């Protein structure tokens, strides 16, 4: 069950942003959102796909273990922050696309398809090129599906060893406080094209006291300068809810 | 570790705050350590709440603690600290150093198993006599800063005699600072203000993962007044910032 919560609309209007926020307390059985329709609309996952990709990489052995170092071969990479040796967390934190493209290539189309089916990951469409389906392909997943997926990870219920799920969870920690812990991942498909803006994401969960909150946010975006809103809008909503 | 060297210049942060203590910092790749005082780096002190690290691992390995989702319910009885009067998860109990939660764990573990694990972990002088629920608080258990970093490195590498799954659970619970370029896992400790001419001890131990490098650290200082407690984190932090590790 997904229920509408009109009290968050202001946060979107203030910035003239078209997007959705999904927040579920304790579990995904009851989630709140500002837009029922957009909550379940499937969008390209962009870099949020690094979460399932990391899990699959570990499960298949492509990623040897948590201490694996992904060496930079010295060839030019889109961003300078990617031009260096990276650990799994390092690669996830700076969203080093090339590291995960190679992981995807080694996983292969057959295994990738099998795991997304096991994970009930969006439309599970990986066609068009094994190293770019989550960047410009036909893969689509909704905010609600993201929360369901993240909840399974939190509970160690995905079809992978608990060990591997724990490894990925540690790589996803983005904020640590004595009060709460935040695990999250950003995504940005690009500025989109004429009349078809791209999508920006921020998904994760907050562990506070004995309670847990799963969240997923996405928005239309046609200018990179608006990118910070993918974190500020959800953060303001969660702060006003007294979560972080 | 492979080597250790003395760097007396780190006494700067100690002298400035009129503090007697030690800091040990080891780089994983080179397997080399540095400290402001070799003698104190090897001196053994009560672990205080830093013992919650091995205690948590042992509780999990023995099955006393089910997993990271187990909730330690508060029975409503008054506790030494107001922050402990609430239900807590494993991480919650570790973060606020809820002593009563771990004393119960220790009692369920029992002396025989506790002794077995500390031997496997090569944890300090491995003397747990004087009460199964307080040997690390006011008993005869002692461990040095060098031993702390050795122990923490083993945990980091999942090389302790425990399931990798349980070591991962504890490691997750120890995260105290997260940034894009570095992650900090740590645990504080404080035995008390001690007696006259015999001050208590305050600790801050953990490790920092920055880039592909890993730094293990252990800090302790003499303390006879709680107002000096924040120094257990500020001194080590300043030293690591000067080293360009955190911040």
Curated annotation (Swiss-Prot), chain B:
SS bond partners: 26-33
Gene3D superfamilies recorded: DD-peptidase/beta-lactamase superfamily
A Pfam family matched in the record: Transpeptidase
Effect the entry attributes to changing residue 8 to M: No effect on catalytic efficiency with respect to penicillins, cephalosporins or carbapenems. No effect on resistance to penicillins, cephalosporins or carbapenems in C600Z1 E.coli strain
Positions carrying N6-carboxylysine: 52
Biological process per Gene Ontology, one example term: antibiotic catabolic process
pH dependence: Optimum pH is between 6 and 7.
Keyword annotations of the record: Antibiotic resistance, Disulfide bond, Hydrolase, Periplasm, Plasmid, Signal, Transposable element
Substrates-to-products reaction catalysed: a beta-lactam + H2O = a substituted beta-amino acid
Cellular localisation: Periplasm
Binding annotation for a beta-lactam: 97, 188, 190, 232
Any one of the GO CC terms: periplasmic space
Recorded GO MF terms: beta-lactamase activity; penicillin binding
Predominant cellular place of this UniProt entry's protein: periplasm
Family of the protein in this entry: Belongs to the class-D beta-lactamase family.
PANTHER family: BETA-LACTAMASE YBXI-RELATED, PEPTIDOGLYCAN D,D-TRANSPEPTIDASE
Job description of the protein: Class D beta-lactamase which confers resistance to the beta-lactam antibiotics, including penicillin, carbenicillin and oxacillin, and also some cephalosporins. Confers weak resistance to some carbapenems, in E.coli strain C600Z1. Acts via hydrolysis of the beta-lactam ring. Has penicillin- and cephalosporin-hydrolyzing activities.
Name under which the protein is recorded: Beta-lactamase OXA-10
Species lineage: Bacteria, Pseudomonadati, Pseudomonadota, Gammaproteobacteria, Pseudomonadales
């Amino acid at each position: 069950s997904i229920t509408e919560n009109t009290s968050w609309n202001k946060e979107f209007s203030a910035e003239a942003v078209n997007g959705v926020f999904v927040l579920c307390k304790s579990s995904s059985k009851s989630c709140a959102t500002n837009d029922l329709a957009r909550a379940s609309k499937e969008y390209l996952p962009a870099s949020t796909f690094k979460i399932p990709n990391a899990i699959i990489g570990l499960e298949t052995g492509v990623i040897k273990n948590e201490h694996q170092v992904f060496k930079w071969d010295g060839k030019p990479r889109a961003m300078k922050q990617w031009e260096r040796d990276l650990t799994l967390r390092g690669a996830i934190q700076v969203s080093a696309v090339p590291v995960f493209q190679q992981i995807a290539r080694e996983v292969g189309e057959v295994r990738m398809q099998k795991y997304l089916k096991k994970f009930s990951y969006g439309n599970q469409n990986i066609s068009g090129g094994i190293d770019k389906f989550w960047l410009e392909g036909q893969l689509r997943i909704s905010a609600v599906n993201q929360v369901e997926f993240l909840e399974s990870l939190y509970l160690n219920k995905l079809s992978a060893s608990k060990e591997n799920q724990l490894i990925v969870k540690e790589a996803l920690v983005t904020e640590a406080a004595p009060e709460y812990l935040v695990h999250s991942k950003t995504g940005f498909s690009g500025v989109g094209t004429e009349s078809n803006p791209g999508v920006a994401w921020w998904v994760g969960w907050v562990e506070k006291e004995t309670e847990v909150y799963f969240f997923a946010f996405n928005m239309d975006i046609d200018n990179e300068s608006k990118l910070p809103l993918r974190k500020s809008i959800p953060t303001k909503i969660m702060e006003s809810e007294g979560i972080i």
